[PDB]
Design a protein around this ligand. Structure first.
Ligand SMILES: Cc1ccncc1NC(=O)Nc1cccc(Cl)c1
Ligand SMILES: Cc1ccncc1NC(=O)Nc1cccc(Cl)c1
Lengths: 304, 304
């Protein structure tokens, strides 16, 4: 019973968080095996951030200029390299708490948990989604850079995000663990506007199935629709177009509830056209799009 | 930038979760020092749950009947006792991962993080509030009993909740770590209705201050009110009465933003009377009451 915006347990990621200082800039690093991963803008001064030439700035840096502290103890840096927008600091010690892990580049609409950190220490954990405009609506302050986004399959942590920057609109941008930014963002202090933040339709449908499973059924109607009819409505409301791939992934939810995907699409269509009329669905007065079909299945089935 | 329903990092609590089996019933236990804490209904069969006499049921149980498994290894039970609605299983081994901890009984309106678990394994973490009717709106399935609610001050974990039951309305009830239920709930399969779930006014005000700090200011008006005038409106909308104690705790938020508490109360009054008019505040179309003033300060300042 009940449905919550739930994050993965953060313990396995907490054991990886370290503090990286270069010059007077301190941010978070991710220590897996004998490598510490951190945003390359750690080498920048606020002056450098306007038009940084990271290759040129990195030439002035040596292994001893990167101060890596894991808890209250210092790690010895025996190598450094830049891979896209991340720095990989080879340390002389393998992280004893390194969990089984993968580096994955997620697609827009996918969700993950963020372990927000400051000075290498965790402050909190929350669930995010990679928006269709490749930004994330997180909660990050100065010093939070290097905090990571991740998913967990039983004992394997799939790192998908590393926080790099706050856009002038208060939304967030970052890279995968190979240093490649999601979206067109660049690590520089230049105004970069985000594109249209469309609603993740397949996620809203999954959350509507979760509402049905949990007893919120007032929005179920006597209608059906087609993928083409639904998508005409979705385009009008800045929702992502629904494909047969989305319908397929909603299959287990449709089977669990006995509500055909296109019937749920018609309920969503009426909710978009008529609004909630002061009502709520799973304690929300708006259509939630940050639960994937997999998240709804996982939460509703108790996967650990 | 940004404001999220953030939970405390769950690592320190993950290292305490164990599986407790008694007969054919398996639930979660909390292992701190050489004691495993779990709901006493672990000794019950589904037949016993209608009118259980826990003292009588416990007489038929011996130390060897409580199977405690921490990860894949078995803990030896050398003692057992019932304290209110929890069982304390003395084991022969102190939990090596026991963090600094306290057992606290929270007040309604206070928030905490829940590490939902099944078979002693964590499935996720989310932020909750003890509702004014002493229920919690969680996300729990069968097998989640014994999952705990907690807060963390730097390195000390204050355990405040242990999950015991789901009321017929899909809301949740449980105890503090001394076995005392929050509210009038009893651990038996009897329909127990919850009281009025009023809105935590001081929390809504704190979340309105967090919205101002993060750029959402459309709801700020040209009005003020008094505590008595505000409370007349609050009574009408099933909001908790606001006291000078609440105003005092909102002091740091009022000082940070330069918005007097009673001016924010007047904004809240207009939001209650007029509604949001299709608008949102911190990505929500309703007034969020599960962030305390301390949570807003902590999140907005980066406390780790
Ligand atoms: C101040 C803050 C708040 C939240 N998240 C992140 C930050 N820091 C931040 O954006 N620094 C920065 C500025 C320009 C470019 C780059 Cl790559 C980094
Ligand atoms: C099924 C479930 C789902 C979520 N949370 C908890 C549960 N289990 C649950 O309530 N068991 C139970 C039944 C009667 C009395 C008592 Cl004390 C316990």
């Amino acid at each position: 019973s009940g449905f919550r915006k739930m994050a993965f347990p953060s313990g396995k990621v907490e054991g990886c968080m370290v503090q990286v200082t270069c010059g007077t800039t301190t941010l978070n690093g991710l220590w897996l095996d004998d490598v510490v991963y951190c945003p390359r803008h750690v080498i920048c001064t606020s002056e450098d951030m306007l038009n940084p030439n990271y290759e040129d700035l990195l030439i002035r840096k040596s292994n001893h200029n990167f101060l890596v502290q894991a808890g209250n103890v210092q790690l010895r840096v025996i190598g450094h390299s830049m891979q896209n927008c991340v720095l990989k600091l080879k340390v002389d010690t393998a992280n004893p708490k390194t969990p089984k892990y993968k580096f994955v580049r997620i697609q827009p609409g996918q969700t993950f948990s963020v372990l927000a950190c400051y000075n290498g220490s965790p402050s909190g954990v929350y669930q995010c989604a990679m928006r269709p405009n490749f930004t994330i609506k997180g909660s990050f302050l100065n010093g939070s850079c290097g905090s990571v986004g991740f998913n967990i399959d039983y004992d394997c942590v799939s790192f998908c995000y590393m926080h790099h920057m706050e856009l002038p609109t208060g939304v967030h941008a970052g890279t995968d663990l190979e240093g490649n930014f999601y979206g067109p963002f660049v690590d520089r202090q230049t105004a970069q506007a985000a594109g249209t933040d469309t609603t993740i339709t397949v996620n809203v449908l999954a959350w509507l199935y979760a509402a049905v499973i949990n007893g919120d059924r007032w929005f179920l109607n006597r209608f059906t629709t087609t993928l083409n009819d639904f998508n005409l409505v979705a385009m009008k409301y800045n929702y992502e177009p629904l494909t047969q791939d989305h319908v397929d992934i909603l299959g287990p939810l449709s089977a669990q509830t006995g509500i055909a995907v296109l019937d749920m699409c018609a309920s969503l269509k009426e909710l978009l056209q008529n609004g909630m009329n002061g009502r709520t669905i799973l304690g929300s007065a708006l259509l939630e799009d940050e639960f994937t079909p997999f998240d709804v299945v996982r939460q509703c089935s108790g996967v650990t």
